[PDB]
Design a protein around this motif. Structure first.
Motif, mmCIF file in Angstrom:
data_model
loop_
_atom_site.group_PDB
_atom_site.id
_atom_site.type_symbol
_atom_site.label_atom_id
_atom_site.label_comp_id
_atom_site.label_asym_id
_atom_site.label_seq_id
_atom_site.Cartn_x
_atom_site.Cartn_y
_atom_site.Cartn_z
ATOM 1 N N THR A 26 -56.405 -43.803 -44.562
ATOM 2 C CA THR A 26 -57.619 -44.473 -44.029
ATOM 3 C C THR A 26 -57.477 -44.573 -42.528
ATOM 4 O O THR A 26 -56.497 -45.175 -42.011
ATOM 5 C CB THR A 26 -57.747 -45.883 -44.601
ATOM 6 O OG1 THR A 26 -57.874 -45.792 -46.031
ATOM 7 C CG2 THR A 26 -58.948 -46.602 -44.051
ATOM 8 N N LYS A 35 -62.620 -51.301 -44.770
ATOM 9 C CA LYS A 35 -61.491 -51.922 -45.434
ATOM 10 C C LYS A 35 -60.907 -53.139 -44.698
ATOM 11 O O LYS A 35 -60.144 -53.904 -45.272
ATOM 12 C CB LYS A 35 -60.387 -50.869 -45.618
ATOM 13 C CG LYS A 35 -60.417 -49.905 -46.756
ATOM 14 C CD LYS A 35 -59.041 -49.306 -47.054
ATOM 15 C CE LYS A 35 -59.106 -48.051 -47.915
ATOM 16 N NZ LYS A 35 -57.772 -47.628 -48.389
ATOM 17 N N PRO A 79 -51.146 -52.531 -43.865
ATOM 18 C CA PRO A 79 -50.749 -52.092 -45.201
ATOM 19 C C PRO A 79 -51.433 -52.849 -46.347
ATOM 20 O O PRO A 79 -51.795 -52.219 -47.358
ATOM 21 C CB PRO A 79 -49.230 -52.261 -45.198
ATOM 22 C CG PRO A 79 -48.874 -52.026 -43.758
ATOM 23 C CD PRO A 79 -49.974 -52.754 -43.007
ATOM 24 N N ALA A 80 -51.576 -54.156 -46.205
ATOM 25 C CA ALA A 80 -52.167 -54.928 -47.310
ATOM 26 C C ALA A 80 -53.646 -54.652 -47.504
ATOM 27 O O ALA A 80 -54.204 -55.058 -48.536
ATOM 28 C CB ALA A 80 -51.938 -56.407 -47.109
ATOM 29 N N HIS A 139 -54.791 -51.589 -47.865
ATOM 30 C CA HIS A 139 -54.955 -50.312 -48.524
ATOM 31 C C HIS A 139 -55.522 -50.410 -49.931
ATOM 32 O O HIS A 139 -56.394 -49.629 -50.318
ATOM 33 C CB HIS A 139 -53.592 -49.615 -48.570
ATOM 34 C CG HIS A 139 -53.682 -48.295 -49.264
ATOM 35 N ND1 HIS A 139 -54.271 -47.185 -48.727
ATOM 36 C CD2 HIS A 139 -53.253 -47.985 -50.523
ATOM 37 C CE1 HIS A 139 -54.197 -46.183 -49.630
ATOM 38 N NE2 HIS A 139 -53.591 -46.618 -50.722
ATOM 39 N N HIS A 140 -54.911 -51.306 -50.739
ATOM 40 C CA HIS A 140 -55.225 -51.225 -52.169
ATOM 41 C C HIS A 140 -56.656 -51.529 -52.446
ATOM 42 O O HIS A 140 -57.146 -52.496 -51.857
ATOM 43 C CB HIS A 140 -54.300 -52.239 -52.890
ATOM 44 C CG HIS A 140 -54.422 -52.093 -54.357
ATOM 45 N ND1 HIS A 140 -55.009 -52.891 -55.270
ATOM 46 C CD2 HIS A 140 -53.956 -50.957 -55.006
ATOM 47 C CE1 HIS A 140 -54.872 -52.292 -56.447
ATOM 48 N NE2 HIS A 140 -54.240 -51.135 -56.330
ATOM 49 N N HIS A 141 -57.272 -50.755 -53.361
ATOM 50 C CA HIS A 141 -58.600 -51.034 -53.810
ATOM 51 C C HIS A 141 -58.493 -51.821 -55.110
ATOM 52 O O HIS A 141 -58.094 -51.286 -56.148
ATOM 53 C CB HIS A 141 -59.408 -49.762 -54.051
ATOM 54 C CG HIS A 141 -60.791 -50.175 -54.490
ATOM 55 N ND1 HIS A 141 -61.215 -50.045 -55.785
ATOM 56 C CD2 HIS A 141 -61.819 -50.738 -53.800
ATOM 57 C CE1 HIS A 141 -62.458 -50.484 -55.870
ATOM 58 N NE2 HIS A 141 -62.847 -50.920 -54.683
ATOM 59 N N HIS A 142 -58.814 -53.105 -55.103
ATOM 60 C CA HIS A 142 -58.652 -53.926 -56.301
ATOM 61 C C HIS A 142 -59.727 -53.804 -57.363
ATOM 62 O O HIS A 142 -60.895 -53.998 -56.974
ATOM 63 C CB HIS A 142 -58.637 -55.407 -55.852
ATOM 64 C CG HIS A 142 -57.368 -55.676 -55.070
ATOM 65 N ND1 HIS A 142 -57.308 -55.576 -53.724
ATOM 66 C CD2 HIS A 142 -56.135 -56.004 -55.484
ATOM 67 C CE1 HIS A 142 -56.072 -55.847 -53.280
ATOM 68 N NE2 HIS A 142 -55.349 -56.113 -54.389
#
Ligand SMILES: [Cl-]
Length: 294
Positions: A30, A121, A288-289, A291-294
């Motif tokens: 990203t 994001k 970094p935190a 990044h994740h797609h929850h």
């Protein structure tokens, strides 16, 4: 604080005109999109990018008419900038992004995020544009100056003919003294007076005392969006600040969802010139935190 600009030029043609941009870092994640304001360029981000580039792509365009970008004969309303930056982002094939935004770059970034919320994001912001409902909300030291800027006669004389935004407002809104090498980087796009149109139109677009109505409305709209958005936010602030004084940053800390505030110490408007290493290091460790797609 580094004075050099050790980034290779990239250019993309959009809407008939070339836009220059920095593009460093890995291509498989990203990207982080850095948006400057008035009267700056990607040079403003030069000491921040190196903290982020190790882990993330960094894309830092020069707005149309600014930096190393081309100079169409435009009025350089906010709407012109919206059109050119929208087209820039699509030309690069960007999908999801993290925004890192300042001043008119923040109006652009928040307006883009409101229209494209699934593609943002995170937002790192500083000294950003919000409505100033009356002139009393504008910082007193800068009130007469900006009132004069926002005129067709005196404002053009000061900004176009005398280069007041570059020679005056810019260094006056950095706490540490800018060096002559740094000033020459900022001066370079604007050596010819006629090319200073964007520098005058920008203060005339600021949403102050209800004027111009279109900008007031669209900034209200992105602020309403921001206050309801769960997107991670990182807000840098300084003392005394200019657009975001300390008490405003503290109100926003409480009133924006998922917002982390970072005190950079002394700062006026161009916070990147007073504490680039804290801004860059804090952005880098926050990415970094997201990044994740929850
Ligand atoms: Cl401005």
């Amino acid at each position: 604080i580094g004075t050099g600009f050790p980034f290779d030029p990239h250019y993309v043609e959009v809407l008939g005109e070339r836009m220059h941009y920095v593009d460093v870092g890995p291509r498989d994640g990203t990207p982080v999109l850095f948006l400057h304001g008035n009267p700056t360029s990607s040079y403003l981000w030069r000491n921040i990018i190196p903290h982020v580039a190790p882990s993330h792509r960094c894309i830092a365009p020069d707005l149309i008419g600014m930096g190393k970008s081309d100079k169409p004969d435009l009025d350089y309303f906010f709407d012109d900038h919206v059109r050119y930056l929208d087209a820039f982002i699509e030309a690069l094939g960007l999908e999801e992004v993290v925004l890192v935004i300042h001043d008119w770059g923040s109006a652009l970034g928040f307006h883009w995020a409101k229209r494209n919320p699934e593609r943002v994001k995170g937002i790192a912001c500083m000294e950003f544009i919000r409505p100033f409902p009356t002139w009393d909300e504008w910082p007193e030291f800068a009130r007469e100056t900006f009132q004069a800027f926002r005129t067709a006669d005196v404002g053009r004389e000061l900004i176009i003919d005398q280069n007041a935004f570059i020679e005056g407002a810019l260094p006056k809104c950095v706490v540490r003294p800018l060096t002559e090498v740094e000033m020459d980087h900022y001066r370079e796009p604007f050596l010819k007076p006629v090319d200073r149109e964007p520098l005058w139109r920008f203060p005339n677009e600021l949403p102050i005392a209800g004027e111009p109505a279109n900008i007031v409305a669209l900034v209200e709209a992105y602020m309403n969006w921001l206050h309801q958005s769960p997107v991670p936010k990182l807000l840098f602030w300084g003392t005394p600040g200019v657009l975001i004084p300390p008490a405003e940053a503290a109100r926003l800390a409480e009133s924006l969802p998922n917002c982390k505030t970072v005190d950079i110490g002394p700062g006026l408007h161009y916070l990147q010139e007073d504490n680039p290493d804290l801004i860059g290091s804090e952005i880098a460790r926050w990415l970094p935190a997201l990044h994740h797609h929850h």
